[PDB]
Amino acid sequence: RAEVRTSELAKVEGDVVSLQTLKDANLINQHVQRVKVMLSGEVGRAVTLKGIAATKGARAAIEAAGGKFED
Amino acid sequence: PKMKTKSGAAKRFKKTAGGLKHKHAFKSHILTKMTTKRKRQLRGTSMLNKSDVARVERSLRLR
Amino acid sequence: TRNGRDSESKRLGVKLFGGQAVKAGNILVRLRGTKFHAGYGVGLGKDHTLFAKVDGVVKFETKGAFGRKYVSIVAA
Amino acid sequence: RELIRLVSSAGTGHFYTTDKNKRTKPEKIEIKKYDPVVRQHVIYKEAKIK
RNA sequence: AAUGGGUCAGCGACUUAUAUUCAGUGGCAAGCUUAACCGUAUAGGGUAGGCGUAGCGAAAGCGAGUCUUAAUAGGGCGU
RNA sequence: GGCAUGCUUGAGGUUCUAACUCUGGUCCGUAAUCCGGAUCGAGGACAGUGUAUGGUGGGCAGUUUGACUGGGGCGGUCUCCUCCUAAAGAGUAACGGAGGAGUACGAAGGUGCGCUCAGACCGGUCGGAAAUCGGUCGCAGAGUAUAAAGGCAAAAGCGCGCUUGACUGCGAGACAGACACGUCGAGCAGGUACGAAAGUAGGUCUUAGUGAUCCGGUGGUUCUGUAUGGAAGGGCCAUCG
């Protein structure tokens, strides 16, 4: 398990927050499979989450601030 | 890392961000005596007392 | 023939004297069976432990026939 | 004062636990007490804790 | 009227290494830092890994809340 | 039932030689009789030896055998309750003076309704200083499941009718206190028993009646379940040594 704050979604590049895109920007760890996103601040840019499952309050922020939650 | 913790105190003390949790004692194997007021007030998970902190935090290798 | 064996001194007494301010669970008197009786706003628990229910000032008054000691709490 | 168990009437494995002087009164009792599963009072009975 | 010392001159007792906690003074700062190893070798590369930015719970899990509970009531811990 | 005979197999009994055995005899290696090899003689599936298991085993070894103590040895004492020492708040020692517990109770608990003691005395059939009954006087001198202390006429003492609140989830507040344990508890929500209804009930007049952790045993529990689907084993809740 690991989890990502909403504020750190503006720290990847390429605006596709995959599973491997969080690893090469060393934001999470190696050998981590299941990831969440919880509410800890404003995101800052429109990114497309996929492969990761946010909480209820987080997806109310990403869908409003230009992002798109698909898989 | 040349600092081995004790294995007993790592199994009786989980650590949270508000101290050290621990289960209450005295609740096993003779229980048909005690009044409930005493059973339901030993069921929770307390946090540790201040005289006991710096004793355990040397047993657990935190110091 | 040999006699040591005392007990361990229960800490009985009277807390909260004549002009104190109280709360709702204060205890005011441990007791050993009704030196003081339940006055106006106090409790008289299981082993004759008095306790408060409302807030104010302790009184310690003697009333009535039999001359018994009434601990009442006055809203003053 | 041997100790006994009081198994519930309904399906639940909830029970009470007390003691009873077996020597003076041999027969079983049928006390009606509360049940924390069905959330109402039913009658109980048993002995024989093991 | 208890111990020790015949006097002199030489030597004679809180050290090191690896982990970790608290203070003093410094560097960068929601981020700080690399170990082996490479290297024209005290420079440079190397961010794997660690500590932090969010908790509560035995756990699954849910998340600025969560656990107990028939609980939406209270209460514990947290912001 | 057995009839037969078979098929296999155990347990016992006798016999046989071919395994093993010979600290037997005479040849050979050899100039040695250790050791082999050849042949006769004896024992013979026993003895003996591996490995698994019972018994005996100071022959041998590693170790244990407490403290307080008007020196320590002998004796007495190690935990809990009440009184005195204890100086009119709490606390407070002595191998200082006196006593008690290691439990009982399904009503000896809840609730509604009723009701008062011991003793003194006088009258009264076989009792007779004293049984039951009647009466006056009483003014707690009785009673309280169990030691003493503190209490008890809304009687906390006594009797009768229904019953299971000897409930589950909690608990603001405090008292104590090195810590671990401890004591009292308004009130809230669930579902109840009395009472016409306010209301009372989270055991007994209060204070002694008891022992952590680790182990293991039994009832509930998807919370986990080492590729996957299940299980074993954990975990949590309840309860036993």
Side-chain angles (χ1 to χ4, degrees), chain B:
Chain B
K2 291 182 99 291
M3 187 73 87
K4 287 185 181 178
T5 68
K6 290 179 71 167
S7 184
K11 297 178 186 177
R12 287 102 191 277
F13 290 112
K14 294 182 186 290
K15 184 177 175 67
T16 54
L20 290 168
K21 294 202 265 78
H22 66 91
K23 194 73 71 175
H24 285 279
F26 279 87
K27 193 180 175 184
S28 291
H29 85 86
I30 178 63
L31 291 164
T32 186
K33 267 72 185 302
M34 302 166 71
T35 313
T36 350
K37 188 187 287 187
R38 256 193 99 194
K39 295 180 186 179
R40 86 165 86 92
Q41 283 176 349
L42 293 174
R43 194 180 292 117
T45 53
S46 178
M47 61 180 285
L48 187 57
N49 193 351
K50 185 255 187 179
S51 299
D52 302 330
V53 171
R55 176 178 288 121
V56 179
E57 290 182 352
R58 290 186 55 198
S59 296
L60 297 173
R61 297 286 188 263
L62 302 179
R63 296 286 181 270

Coordinates of all heavy atoms in Angstrom, one line a residue, chain B:
Chain B
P1 N 22.2 -2.3 11.1 CA 21.8 -1.4 12.2 C 22.0 -2.0 13.5 O 21.3 -2.9 13.9 CB 20.3 -1.1 11.9 CG 19.9 -2.3 11.1 CD 21.0 -2.7 10.3
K2 N 23.0 -1.5 14.3 CA 23.5 -2.3 15.5 C 22.6 -2.0 16.7 O 23.2 -2.1 17.8 CB 24.9 -1.8 15.8 CG 25.9 -2.3 14.7 CD 27.4 -2.0 15.1 CE 28.1 -3.1 15.7 NZ 27.6 -3.5 17.1
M3 N 21.3 -1.8 16.5 CA 20.5 -1.5 17.6 C 19.2 -2.4 17.6 O 18.2 -2.0 16.9 CB 20.1 0.0 17.6 CG 19.4 0.5 18.7 SD 20.3 0.7 20.2 CE 21.0 2.3 19.9
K4 N 19.3 -3.5 18.2 CA 18.2 -4.4 18.2 C 17.1 -4.1 19.2 O 17.4 -3.9 20.4 CB 18.6 -5.9 18.4 CG 19.4 -6.5 17.3 CD 19.7 -7.9 17.6 CE 20.5 -8.6 16.5 NZ 20.8 -10.0 16.8
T5 N 15.9 -4.1 18.8 CA 14.8 -3.8 19.7 C 14.5 -5.1 20.5 O 15.0 -6.2 20.2 CB 13.5 -3.3 19.0 OG1 13.0 -4.4 18.2 CG2 13.9 -2.2 18.1
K6 N 13.7 -4.9 21.6 CA 13.2 -6.1 22.2 C 11.9 -6.6 21.5 O 11.2 -5.8 21.0 CB 12.9 -5.8 23.7 CG 14.2 -5.7 24.4 CD 14.0 -5.4 25.8 CE 13.5 -6.6 26.5 NZ 13.6 -6.4 28.0
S7 N 11.8 -7.9 21.5 CA 10.7 -8.5 20.7 C 9.4 -8.5 21.5 O 8.3 -8.6 20.9 CB 11.1 -9.9 20.2 OG 10.1 -10.4 19.4
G8 N 9.5 -8.5 22.8 CA 8.3 -8.6 23.6 C 7.6 -7.3 23.6 O 6.4 -7.2 23.2
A9 N 8.2 -6.2 23.9 CA 7.6 -4.8 23.9 C 7.2 -4.3 22.5 O 6.5 -3.4 22.5 CB 8.6 -3.8 24.5
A10 N 7.6 -5.0 21.5 CA 7.1 -4.7 20.1 C 5.8 -5.4 19.9 O 5.2 -5.2 18.8 CB 8.1 -5.0 19.1
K11 N 5.4 -6.3 20.7 CA 4.2 -7.1 20.6 C 3.2 -6.7 21.6 O 2.0 -7.1 21.5 CB 4.5 -8.6 20.7 CG 5.3 -9.2 19.7 CD 5.5 -10.6 20.0 CE 6.5 -11.3 19.1 NZ 6.7 -12.7 19.5
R12 N 3.5 -5.9 22.7 CA 2.6 -5.4 23.6 C 2.3 -3.9 23.4 O 1.4 -3.3 24.1 CB 3.0 -5.6 25.0 CG 2.8 -7.0 25.5 CD 4.2 -7.7 25.5 NE 4.1 -9.1 25.7 CZ 4.0 -9.7 26.9 NH1 3.9 -9.0 28.0 NH2 3.9 -11.0 26.9
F13 N 3.1 -3.2 22.5 CA 3.0 -1.8 22.4 C 3.0 -1.4 20.9 O 4.0 -1.4 20.3 CB 4.1 -1.1 23.1 CG 4.0 -1.1 24.5 CD1 4.9 -1.8 25.3 CD2 3.1 -0.4 25.2 CE1 4.9 -1.9 26.6 CE2 3.0 -0.5 26.6 CZ 3.9 -1.2 27.3
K14 N 1.8 -1.2 20.3 CA 1.8 -0.6 19.0 C 1.9 0.9 19.2 O 1.6 1.5 20.2 CB 0.4 -0.8 18.3 CG 0.2 -2.3 18.0 CD -1.1 -2.5 17.3 CE -1.4 -4.0 17.1 NZ -0.5 -4.6 16.1
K15 N 2.5 1.6 18.2 CA 2.8 3.0 18.3 C 2.0 3.8 17.3 O 2.0 3.5 16.1 CB 4.3 3.3 18.0 CG 4.5 4.8 18.2 CD 5.9 5.2 18.0 CE 6.1 6.7 18.1 NZ 5.7 7.2 19.5
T16 N 1.2 4.7 17.8 CA 0.4 5.7 17.0 C 1.0 7.1 17.2 O 2.0 7.3 17.9 CB -1.0 5.6 17.4 OG1 -1.2 5.8 18.8 CG2 -1.6 4.3 17.0
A17 N 0.4 8.0 16.5 CA 0.9 9.4 16.5 C 0.3 10.2 17.7 O 0.2 11.4 17.6 CB 0.5 10.1 15.2
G18 N -0.2 9.5 18.7 CA -0.6 10.1 19.9 C -0.2 9.3 21.1 O -0.9 9.1 22.1
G19 N 1.0 8.7 21.1 CA 1.6 7.9 22.2 C 1.7 6.4 21.8 O 2.0 6.1 20.7
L20 N 1.6 5.6 22.8 CA 1.7 4.1 22.7 C 0.5 3.5 23.1 O 0.1 3.6 24.3 CB 2.9 3.6 23.4 CG 4.3 4.0 22.9 CD1 5.4 3.7 23.9 CD2 4.6 3.3 21.7
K21 N -0.2 2.7 22.3 CA -1.3 1.9 22.7 C -0.9 0.7 23.4 O 0.1 0.2 23.2 CB -2.2 1.5 21.5 CG -2.8 2.6 20.7 CD -4.0 2.0 19.9 CE -3.7 1.6 18.5 NZ -3.0 0.3 18.4
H22 N -1.8 0.2 24.3 CA -1.6 -1.0 25.0 C -3.0 -1.6 25.5 O -3.9 -0.8 25.8 CB -0.7 -0.9 26.1 CG -1.2 -0.1 27.3 ND1 -1.9 -0.6 28.3 CD2 -1.1 1.3 27.5 CE1 -2.2 0.4 29.1 NE2 -1.7 1.5 28.7
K23 N -3.1 -2.9 25.5 CA -4.3 -3.5 26.0 C -4.3 -3.5 27.5 O -3.2 -3.6 28.1 CB -4.4 -4.9 25.4 CG -5.8 -5.6 25.5 CD -6.8 -5.0 24.6 CE -6.4 -5.3 23.2 NZ -7.4 -4.9 22.2
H24 N -5.5 -3.5 28.1 CA -5.6 -3.6 29.6 C -5.3 -5.0 30.0 O -5.6 -6.0 29.3 CB -6.9 -3.1 30.1 CG -7.1 -1.7 30.0 ND1 -6.5 -0.9 31.0 CD2 -7.6 -0.8 29.1 CE1 -6.8 0.4 30.8 NE2 -7.5 0.5 29.6
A25 N -4.9 -5.2 31.3 CA -4.6 -6.5 31.9 C -5.8 -7.0 32.6 O -6.9 -6.5 32.5 CB -3.4 -6.4 32.8
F26 N -5.6 -8.1 33.4 CA -6.5 -8.7 34.4 C -7.7 -9.4 33.8 O -8.5 -9.8 34.5 CB -7.0 -7.8 35.5 CG -6.0 -7.6 36.6 CD1 -5.0 -6.6 36.5 CD2 -6.1 -8.4 37.7 CE1 -4.1 -6.5 37.5 CE2 -5.2 -8.3 38.7 CZ -4.2 -7.3 38.6
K27 N -7.9 -9.4 32.5 CA -9.1 -10.0 31.9 C -8.7 -11.3 31.2 O -8.6 -11.3 29.9 CB -9.7 -8.9 31.0 CG -11.1 -9.3 30.6 CD -11.8 -8.3 29.7 CE -13.1 -8.8 29.3 NZ -13.8 -7.9 28.3
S28 N -8.7 -12.3 31.9 CA -8.6 -13.7 31.5 C -8.8 -14.7 32.6 O -8.5 -14.4 33.8 CB -7.3 -14.1 30.8 OG -7.2 -13.4 29.6
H29 N -9.4 -15.8 32.3 CA -9.4 -17.1 33.0 C -10.0 -17.1 34.4 O -10.1 -18.2 35.0 CB -8.0 -17.6 33.1 CG -7.1 -17.1 34.2 ND1 -7.1 -17.7 35.5 CD2 -6.1 -16.2 34.2 CE1 -6.2 -17.1 36.2 NE2 -5.6 -16.2 35.5
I30 N -10.4 -16.0 35.1 CA -11.3 -16.1 36.1 C -12.2 -14.8 36.0 O -11.9 -13.8 36.5 CB -10.7 -16.3 37.5 CG1 -11.8 -16.3 38.6 CG2 -9.5 -15.4 37.8 CD1 -12.8 -17.4 38.4
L31 N -13.4 -15.0 35.5 CA -14.2 -13.9 35.0 C -15.6 -14.0 35.5 O -16.4 -13.0 35.4 CB -14.2 -13.9 33.5 CG -13.0 -13.5 32.8 CD1 -13.1 -13.9 31.3 CD2 -12.7 -12.0 32.9
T32 N -16.0 -15.1 36.1 CA -17.4 -15.2 36.7 C -17.5 -14.5 38.0 O -18.6 -14.5 38.6 CB -17.7 -16.7 36.8 OG1 -19.1 -16.8 37.2 CG2 -16.9 -17.3 37.8
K33 N -16.4 -14.0 38.6 CA -16.5 -13.2 39.8 C -16.9 -11.8 39.4 O -17.8 -11.3 40.1 CB -15.1 -13.1 40.4 CG -14.8 -14.1 41.5 CD -14.5 -15.5 41.0 CE -14.4 -16.4 42.2 NZ -13.2 -16.0 43.0
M34 N -16.3 -11.2 38.5 CA -16.2 -9.7 38.3 C -17.5 -9.1 37.8 O -18.3 -9.8 37.0 CB -15.1 -9.4 37.3 CG -13.7 -9.9 37.8 SD -12.4 -9.9 36.5 CE -12.1 -8.2 36.3
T35 N -17.8 -7.9 38.3 CA -19.1 -7.3 37.8 C -18.8 -6.6 36.5 O -17.7 -6.1 36.2 CB -19.5 -6.3 38.9 OG1 -19.4 -6.9 40.2 CG2 -20.9 -5.8 38.7
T36 N -19.9 -6.5 35.7 CA -19.7 -6.0 34.3 C -19.1 -4.6 34.4 O -18.2 -4.3 33.6 CB -21.0 -5.9 33.6 OG1 -22.0 -6.6 34.3 CG2 -20.9 -6.6 32.2
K37 N -19.5 -3.8 35.3 CA -18.9 -2.4 35.4 C -17.4 -2.5 35.2 O -16.8 -1.6 34.7 CB -19.4 -1.7 36.6 CG -19.0 -0.2 36.7 CD -19.2 0.4 38.0 CE -20.7 0.6 38.2 NZ -21.0 1.4 39.5
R38 N -16.9 -3.6 35.7 CA -15.4 -3.9 35.7 C -15.0 -4.6 34.4 O -13.8 -4.5 34.0 CB -15.0 -4.7 36.9 CG -14.3 -4.0 37.9 CD -13.6 -4.9 38.9 NE -12.2 -5.0 38.7 CZ -11.4 -6.0 39.2 NH1 -12.0 -6.9 40.0 NH2 -10.2 -6.0 38.9
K39 N -15.9 -5.2 33.7 CA -15.5 -5.9 32.5 C -15.5 -4.9 31.3 O -14.6 -5.0 30.5 CB -16.5 -7.1 32.2 CG -16.4 -8.2 33.2 CD -17.3 -9.2 32.8 CE -17.4 -10.3 33.9 NZ -18.4 -11.3 33.5
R40 N -16.5 -4.1 31.2 CA -16.7 -3.1 30.1 C -15.7 -1.9 30.2 O -15.6 -1.2 29.3 CB -18.1 -2.7 29.9 CG -18.5 -1.5 30.8 CD -19.8 -0.9 30.3 NE -21.0 -1.6 30.9 CZ -21.5 -1.2 32.0 NH1 -21.1 -0.1 32.7 NH2 -22.6 -1.9 32.5
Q41 N -15.2 -1.8 31.4 CA -14.2 -0.7 31.6 C -12.8 -1.3 31.6 O -11.9 -0.7 32.2 CB -14.4 0.0 32.9 CG -15.6 1.0 32.8 CD -15.9 1.6 34.1 OE1 -15.4 1.2 35.1 NE2 -16.7 2.7 34.1
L42 N -12.6 -2.5 31.0 CA -11.2 -3.0 30.7 C -11.2 -3.5 29.3 O -10.3 -4.2 28.9 CB -10.9 -4.1 31.7 CG -10.7 -3.7 33.2 CD1 -10.5 -5.0 34.0 CD2 -9.5 -2.8 33.3
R43 N -12.2 -3.1 28.5 CA -12.3 -3.7 27.2 C -11.5 -2.8 26.1 O -11.1 -3.4 25.1 CB -13.7 -3.8 26.8 CG -14.0 -4.7 25.6 CD -15.4 -4.9 25.2 NE -16.1 -5.6 26.2 CZ -17.1 -5.1 26.9 NH1 -17.5 -3.9 26.7 NH2 -17.8 -5.9 27.8
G44 N -11.3 -1.5 26.4 CA -10.7 -0.7 25.4 C -9.2 -0.8 25.2 O -8.6 -1.9 25.6
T45 N -8.6 0.2 24.6 CA -7.2 0.2 24.3 C -6.7 1.5 24.7 O -6.8 2.5 24.0 CB -7.0 0.0 22.8 OG1 -7.8 0.9 22.1 CG2 -7.3 -1.4 22.4
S46 N -6.0 1.6 25.9 CA -5.6 2.9 26.5 C -4.3 3.4 25.8 O -3.8 2.7 24.9 CB -5.4 2.8 28.0 OG -5.0 4.0 28.5
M47 N -3.9 4.5 26.2 CA -2.6 5.1 25.9 C -1.8 5.2 27.2 O -2.3 5.3 28.3 CB -2.7 6.4 25.2 CG -3.4 7.5 26.0 SD -3.5 9.0 25.2 CE -1.9 9.7 25.3
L48 N -0.5 5.2 27.0 CA 0.5 4.9 28.1 C 0.7 6.2 28.9 O 0.6 7.3 28.5 CB 1.8 4.4 27.5 CG 2.9 3.9 28.4 CD1 2.4 2.8 29.2 CD2 4.0 3.4 27.5
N49 N 1.0 5.9 30.2 CA 1.2 7.0 31.2 C 2.6 7.5 31.1 O 3.6 6.9 30.7 CB 0.9 6.4 32.6 CG 0.8 7.4 33.7 OD1 1.0 8.6 33.5 ND2 0.3 7.0 34.8
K50 N 2.8 8.8 31.7 CA 3.9 9.6 31.4 C 5.1 9.1 32.2 O 6.3 9.3 31.8 CB 3.6 11.0 31.8 CG 4.6 12.1 31.5 CD 5.3 12.6 32.8 CE 6.3 13.7 32.5 NZ 6.9 14.2 33.8
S51 N 4.9 8.4 33.4 CA 6.0 7.8 34.1 C 6.6 6.6 33.4 O 7.7 6.2 33.6 CB 5.5 7.4 35.5 OG 5.1 8.5 36.2
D52 N 5.8 6.0 32.5 CA 6.2 4.8 31.9 C 6.7 5.0 30.5 O 7.2 4.0 29.9 CB 4.9 3.9 31.8 CG 4.3 3.6 33.1 OD1 5.1 3.6 34.1 OD2 3.1 3.5 33.2
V53 N 6.7 6.2 30.0 CA 7.1 6.5 28.6 C 8.6 6.3 28.4 O 9.1 5.5 27.6 CB 6.7 7.9 28.1 CG1 7.3 8.2 26.8 CG2 5.2 8.0 28.0
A54 N 9.4 7.0 29.3 CA 10.8 6.9 29.1 C 11.4 5.6 29.6 O 12.7 5.4 29.5 CB 11.5 8.1 29.8
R55 N 10.7 4.8 30.2 CA 11.1 3.4 30.5 C 11.0 2.5 29.3 O 11.9 1.8 29.0 CB 10.3 2.8 31.7 CG 10.7 1.4 32.0 CD 10.0 0.8 33.2 NE 10.5 1.3 34.5 CZ 9.7 2.0 35.3 NH1 8.4 2.1 35.1 NH2 10.2 2.4 36.5
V56 N 9.8 2.6 28.6 CA 9.6 1.7 27.5 C 10.3 2.2 26.3 O 10.9 1.4 25.5 CB 8.1 1.6 27.2 CG1 7.8 0.8 26.0 CG2 7.4 1.1 28.4
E57 N 10.5 3.5 26.1 CA 11.2 4.0 24.9 C 12.7 3.8 25.0 O 13.4 4.3 24.1 CB 10.9 5.5 24.7 CG 9.5 5.7 24.2 CD 9.2 7.1 24.0 OE1 10.0 8.0 24.3 OE2 8.1 7.4 23.4
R58 N 13.2 3.2 26.1 CA 14.5 2.6 26.0 C 14.5 1.1 25.7 O 15.5 0.5 25.2 CB 15.2 2.8 27.4 CG 15.7 4.2 27.7 CD 16.4 4.1 28.9 NE 17.5 3.1 28.7 CZ 18.2 2.5 29.7 NH1 17.9 2.8 30.9 NH2 19.1 1.6 29.4
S59 N 13.4 0.4 26.1 CA 13.3 -1.0 25.8 C 13.0 -1.2 24.3 O 13.8 -2.0 23.7 CB 12.2 -1.6 26.6 OG 12.5 -1.6 28.0
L60 N 12.0 -0.7 23.8 CA 12.0 -0.3 22.4 C 13.1 0.6 22.2 O 13.3 1.6 22.9 CB 10.6 0.3 22.0 CG 9.4 -0.5 22.2 CD1 8.2 0.4 21.9 CD2 9.4 -1.6 21.2
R61 N 13.9 0.4 21.2 CA 15.1 1.2 20.9 C 14.7 2.5 20.2 O 14.9 2.6 19.0 CB 16.1 0.4 20.2 CG 16.6 -0.8 20.9 CD 17.5 -0.5 22.0 NE 18.1 -1.7 22.6 CZ 17.6 -2.3 23.7 NH1 16.6 -1.8 24.3 NH2 18.2 -3.4 24.1
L62 N 14.2 3.4 21.0 CA 13.9 4.7 20.4 C 14.9 5.7 20.9 O 15.2 6.7 20.1 CB 12.4 5.1 20.8 CG 11.4 4.1 20.3 CD1 10.0 4.4 20.7 CD2 11.5 3.9 18.8
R63 N 15.4 5.6 22.1 CA 16.5 6.4 22.5 C 17.9 6.0 22.0 O 18.5 6.7 21.1 CB 16.6 6.4 24.1 CG 15.4 6.9 24.7 CD 15.3 8.4 24.7 NE 14.2 9.0 25.3 CZ 13.0 9.2 24.7 NH1 12.9 8.9 23.4 NH2 12.0 9.7 25.4

